[PDB]
Amino acid sequence: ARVLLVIDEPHTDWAKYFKGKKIHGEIDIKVEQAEFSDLNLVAHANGGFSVDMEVLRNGVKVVRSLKPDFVLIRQHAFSMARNGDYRSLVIGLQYAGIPSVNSLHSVYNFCDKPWVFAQMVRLHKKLGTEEFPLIDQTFYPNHKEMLSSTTYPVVVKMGHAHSGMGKVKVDNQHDFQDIASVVALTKTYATAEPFIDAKYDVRVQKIGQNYKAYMRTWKTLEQIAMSDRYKLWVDTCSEIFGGLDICAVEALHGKDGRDHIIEVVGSSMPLIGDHQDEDKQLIVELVVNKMTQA
Amino acid sequence: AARVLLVIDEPHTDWAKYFKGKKIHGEIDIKVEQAEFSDLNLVAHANGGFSVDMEVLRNGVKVVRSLKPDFVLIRQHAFSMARNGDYRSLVIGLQYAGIPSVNSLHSVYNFCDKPWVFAQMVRLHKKLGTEEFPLIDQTFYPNHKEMLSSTTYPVVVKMGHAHSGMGKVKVDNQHDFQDIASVVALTKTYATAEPFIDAKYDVRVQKIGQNYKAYMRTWKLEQIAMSDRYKLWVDTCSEIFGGLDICAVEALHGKDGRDHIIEVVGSSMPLIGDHQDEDKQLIVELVVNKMTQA
Amino acid sequence: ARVLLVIDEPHTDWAKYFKGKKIHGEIDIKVEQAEFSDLNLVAHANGGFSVDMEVLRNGVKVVRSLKPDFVLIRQHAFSMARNGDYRSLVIGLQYAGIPSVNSLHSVYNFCDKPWVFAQMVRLHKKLGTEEFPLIDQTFYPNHKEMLSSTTYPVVVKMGHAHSGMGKVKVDNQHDFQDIASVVALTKTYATAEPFIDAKYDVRVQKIGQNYKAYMRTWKTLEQIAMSDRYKLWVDTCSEIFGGLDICAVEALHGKDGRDHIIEVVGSSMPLIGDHQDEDKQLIVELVVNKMTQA
Amino acid sequence: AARVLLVIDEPHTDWAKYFKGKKIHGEIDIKVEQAEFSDLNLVAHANGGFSVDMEVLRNGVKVVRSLKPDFVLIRQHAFSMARNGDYRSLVIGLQYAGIPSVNSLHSVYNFCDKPWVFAQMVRLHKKLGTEEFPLIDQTFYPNHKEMLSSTTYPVVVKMGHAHSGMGKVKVDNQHDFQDIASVVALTKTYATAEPFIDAKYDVRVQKIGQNYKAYMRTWKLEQIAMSDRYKLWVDTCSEIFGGLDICAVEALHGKDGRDHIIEVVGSSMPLIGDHQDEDKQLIVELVVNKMTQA
Numbered sequence A, C: 001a002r003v004l005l006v007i008d009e010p011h012t013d014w015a016k017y018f019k020g021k022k023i024h025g026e027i028d029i030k031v032e033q034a035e036f037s038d039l040n041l042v043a044h045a046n047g048g049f050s051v052d053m054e055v056l057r058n059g060v061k062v063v064r065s066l067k068p069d070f071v072l073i074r075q076h077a078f079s080m081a082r083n084g085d086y087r088s089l090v091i092g093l094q095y096a097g098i099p100s101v102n103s104l105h106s107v108y109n110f111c112d113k114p115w116v117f118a119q120m121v122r123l124h125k126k127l128g129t130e131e132f133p134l135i136d137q138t139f140y141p142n143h144k145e146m147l148s149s150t151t152y153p154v155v156v157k158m159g160h161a162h163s164g165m166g167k168v169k170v171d172n173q174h175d176f177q178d179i180a181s182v183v184a185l186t187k188t189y190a191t192a193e194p195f196i197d198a199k200y201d202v203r204v205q206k207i208g209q210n211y212k213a214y215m216r217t218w219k220t221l222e223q224i225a226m227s228d229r230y231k232l233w234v235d236t237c238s239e240i241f242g243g244l245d246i247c248a249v250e251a252l253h254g255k256d257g258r259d260h261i262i263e264v265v266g267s268s269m270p271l272i273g274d275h276q277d278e279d280k281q282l283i284v285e286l287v288v289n290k291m292t293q294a
Numbered sequence B, D: 001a002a003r004v005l006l007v008i009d010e011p012h013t014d015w016a017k018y019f020k021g022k023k024i025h026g027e028i029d030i031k032v033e034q035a036e037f038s039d040l041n042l043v044a045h046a047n048g049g050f051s052v053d054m055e056v057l058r059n060g061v062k063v064v065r066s067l068k069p070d071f072v073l074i075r076q077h078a079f080s081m082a083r084n085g086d087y088r089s090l091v092i093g094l095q096y097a098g099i100p101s102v103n104s105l106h107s108v109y110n111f112c113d114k115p116w117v118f119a120q121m122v123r124l125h126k127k128l129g130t131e132e133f134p135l136i137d138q139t140f141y142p143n144h145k146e147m148l149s150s151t152t153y154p155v156v157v158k159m160g161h162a163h164s165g166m167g168k169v170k171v172d173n174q175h176d177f178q179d180i181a182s183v184v185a186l187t188k189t190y191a192t193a194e195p196f197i198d199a200k201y202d203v204r205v206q207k208i209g210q211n212y213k214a215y216m217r218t219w220k221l222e223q224i225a226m227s228d229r230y231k232l233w234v235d236t237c238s239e240i241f242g243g244l245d246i247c248a249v250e251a252l253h254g255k256d257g258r259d260h261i262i263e264v265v266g267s268s269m270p271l272i273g274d275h276q277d278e279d280k281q282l283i284v285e286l287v288v289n290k291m292t293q294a
């Protein structure tokens, strides 16, 4: 039986979602699940390797080792918040040669938001604003370059973090200077972009060959029909770093009728709307299909 | 043989000139070496041996001068959470070597966490009461997780340990407070929140040895007469951590007539007003007296 | 009833050890226990404050808040190992004005081993080697000063860590250089001291007015009679940073008959030998006595 | 108008002199700006605008020169875990700005974690086999907790990501391995362990564009003829991360006749031997050709 390690929080019972799924209608799939914080590993160039997972057995913490044949990463591999760095585990998994969704290569390169955004910048130069309306954004390697903004208000996004973390709205120059000094204390990079007075925002997702668009109506659901414009946004983004099996594009719709793409997320993208259960099943088949190629 | 005094301060002030002619016991001369924390390193041995190394430029080449200070005057901040502002190990090394200092190395070390210093002031307020020691209301958060709200707005949030306005922001409402806490998380350190004071002017009461002065500066200059009120503020504060030879107390004077003590500063306090020259001579006198005792 | 917060691992049931103890034979003591990693807090200058403890209730993680009237710290407040920094909690407790054993002031100043060692260096200059045989040791603020050792082998101790962590034996110059480069990666201070070929080592402890000496026979019990020589070692060390209620002195006995004091530990000192249960009871009375003064 | 080339390298080499006279399409001139990572900063905008700022000394004052490179040649390491050796955000910024480079910014970024690079070599060994690609046996540890033992001694432990011998130690036995792991914990990063090779000599096979050279250096120099064996090592490695215009493979030759590939280097590879001058001209040629394509 093939062993699948799924790195996600306990809320979703992936074992139950993969129950009965087989590779070539004959080989069974054993699902192992845990969060990055409860994992460790050792990998050898000769191919030998082990993944150690801390779990609870009869009220006591124990370590059980496994050897995944495949991995599904649903959690962020990196966050500049304390204790949120698991890049070394991603490196170890690649070192062990274990296949993954999304690919370990893409997961590693997704560990710096501005690095991913740089990929969108290139796509925007290539496609033009009409087809790919990337929001204006400025990147500062560190606080020394954060002197001013030519327009206000702007949204400052500090380092690499998720779920609203490290993000603030700045209304004037004096406050921008105060915020830049806070960036100094984070000792990392930051970006600034025009604040969009949004009527609503839109997220276009792509799991395998399945698409869905959702309208979400400052720091914040109804589904909407896919359009070829939306399809292009996510299709082109899904091509970076060798290809993203699970990804989505976030855009803000201004009260002036303009769209502004502000981010592309990877295999850790949250499932939203009234069809989350369906999305999990779609993820299962994609994983199953990917595992079949081995 | 002359007694060597190391002054840690920027070059602007020529302490050698100010100490020129000064003698210990009217016979022993004083040799003045001066450098900034960034130009220093050292090695100390439990047996008493040590060397304070000063990096200097010679014939366009980086060379090192080895000194054995008999005493040290510290005029720069020993710590800042901004990149490369950490000189705590030098303070540790100077104490390891047993070198006497102004202010004391013990107090300098304990002054490296603003809230730790504020904690002493909290104790003094509990003891003396509001009328005599009007300490501003303040809240300490070990980390961003406890920053949920503020009973009153606007507030001034001060992040970690930093100087010259760095990491200090004015928050006007609850939602903004939340966004600011999401950024505190990127600093990975503590923070405090205190009521924003609509000040009419702020006052700073300084004490150098036995010389007192008071200055009035009217959101981030006139000398005024000392009062027994002011004298009590600085006399009380000057006693913490075994005693501060040089220190000052900063208080904001609200428009409703209330005073709010917001900070106590050590030997790094900047010299201000039309008596800076006199203050420097006063420091010279204080140090020579401290040096005489050894 | 007075609330006592004991910060220690779960192995010891402090509630059971404090069961029945009363202040003035009438006031009861409610014992709360948890580790630094499961705690957080908020403190206000006006005296208001809360300590939040994460615990498990029916298999789920919950937060219950308390307001300790006193604290007993049996765990290290700082370790440079990942996620081992709880200095901000110690700062918060002092900010809230909560009494402790050992004192919060001493616990804070014990967060840098070389800073504590500097205190022993001063005691050695004062008492002399015959009475206080402090081991030779060299302090490096950073790796740039770690060039060589005049004798080998030596023991290199990196940064601030416990239970053998960060400590290695270096036999020659080339290896010393390799180790110094490792120090560069820790980006912190380090010390080097002669390697003692020890017949055995000795630890002299002092809990309140109770003393005990233990012989422990490279990186490693039988009790031994207190002597006035041993008593002097711990008595003098127990006086630093305003006084240590719980502390011990570690010394190595060379095969050449010389003793070498290498460290002084605080209220987190481990209980050893066949009288640990007794030591816990002695700790209880000291705490009870200390609490009675409030 | 001339095309601007920014060379990131130490001053020792005068790339302006080597590029002097070179022209793109025989008509367009090349302007050479040169600086070290430590002297650079930048700001990049999604709209294409950007500025690479070079700090320089003018009339004894620190001033900034703003440049807009059309291409960049990177000859220095972009990352080191030693204090202030982190220039990853500059690499991110140069890509954000869309500036073409040698080696590619993508490969430079992915080369910032030695084991991540080694993981690619692991893959190549699995594919080509030992006879053609003799990759040394190596073990990857995400952190110190998994470092428990080594099947064979002595071993060479390499900590985190650093250069010029930094963080690399030779361990001769099990107990020492444990002590070394206790220090890895202070580095708070990953480490690898590989068999110590009792080498007779080591070889480095380099590839600059289409020019190959091989050098023999006989525990931490003669040119030899290229072989199809050597050509295959560097040709294979030169293909990772989309292709390496400049790279080299380091292999240790054991006394038992076995070869052990221990490392692949990128555009920062030092120039060695009696053909350094020629190698520089070869790099000039390679860059001019890459610049011609734009």
Ligand SMILES: Nc1ncnc2c1ncn2[C@@H]1O[C@H](COP(=O)(O)OP(=O)(O)OP(=O)(O)O)[C@@H](O)[C@H]1O
Residues within 6 Å of the ligand: A155, A161, A162, A163, A164, A165, A167, A193, A194, A195, A196, A197, A198, A201, A218, A219, A220, A250, A252, A262, A263, A265
């Ligand atoms: N330029 C902007 N103008 C207006 N609102 C913005 C802007 N950027 C972000 N926001 C708001 O802030 C929210 C959070 O920001 P964003 O989506 O960039 O970060 P995040 O959700 O923390 O990122 P991650 O996907 O890593 O979790 C957005 O969903 C949106 O409501």
Ligand SMILES: Nc1ncnc2c1ncn2[C@@H]1O[C@H](COP(=O)(O)OP(=O)(O)OP(=O)(O)O)[C@@H](O)[C@H]1O
Residues within 6 Å of the ligand: B156, B162, B163, B164, B165, B166, B168, B194, B195, B196, B197, B198, B199, B202, B219, B220, B250, B252, B262, B263, B265
């Ligand atoms: N609660 C407050 N209300 C209004 N203004 C404040 C308040 N706290 C600080 N300020 C203003 O900010 C200025 C600087 O803040 P503060 O003195 O606390 O820090 P700092 O100057 O950065 O510290 P340091 O003295 O270390 O350099 C004060 O002089 C005052 O003008």
Ligand SMILES: Nc1ncnc2c1ncn2[C@@H]1O[C@H](COP(=O)(O)OP(=O)(O)OP(=O)(O)O)[C@@H](O)[C@H]1O
Residues within 6 Å of the ligand: C155, C161, C162, C163, C164, C165, C167, C193, C194, C195, C196, C197, C198, C201, C218, C219, C220, C250, C252, C262, C263, C265
């Ligand atoms: N100079 C030395 N010579 C020989 N052995 C030494 C020396 N220093 C330490 N050791 C050995 O290493 C052990 C651990 O070192 P040490 O006691 O200094 O650190 P630790 O126990 O990690 O400190 P902590 O008390 O913070 O837990 C000692 O108990 C002793 O066996």
Ligand SMILES: Nc1ncnc2c1ncn2[C@@H]1O[C@H](COP(=O)(O)OP(=O)(O)OP(=O)(O)O)[C@@H](O)[C@H]1O
Residues within 6 Å of the ligand: D156, D162, D163, D164, D165, D166, D168, D194, D195, D196, D197, D198, D199, D202, D219, D220, D250, D252, D262, D263, D265
């Ligand atoms: N397994 C090994 N056995 C014996 N010697 C080794 C081994 N690994 C490395 N060395 C020696 O150490 C030298 C330097 O190590 P290595 O090239 O791995 O790192 P480095 O030079 O620090 O890295 P970089 O190339 O980034 O600067 C090698 O040239 C070789 O002489």
Ligand SMILES: [Ca+2]
Residues within 6 Å of the ligand: A250, A263
């Ligand atoms: Ca988002």
Ligand SMILES: [Ca+2]
Residues within 6 Å of the ligand: B250, B263
């Ligand atoms: Ca101030």
Ligand SMILES: [Ca+2]
Residues within 6 Å of the ligand: C250, C263
């Ligand atoms: Ca010890």
Ligand SMILES: [Ca+2]
Residues within 6 Å of the ligand: D250, D263
């Ligand atoms: Ca090398």
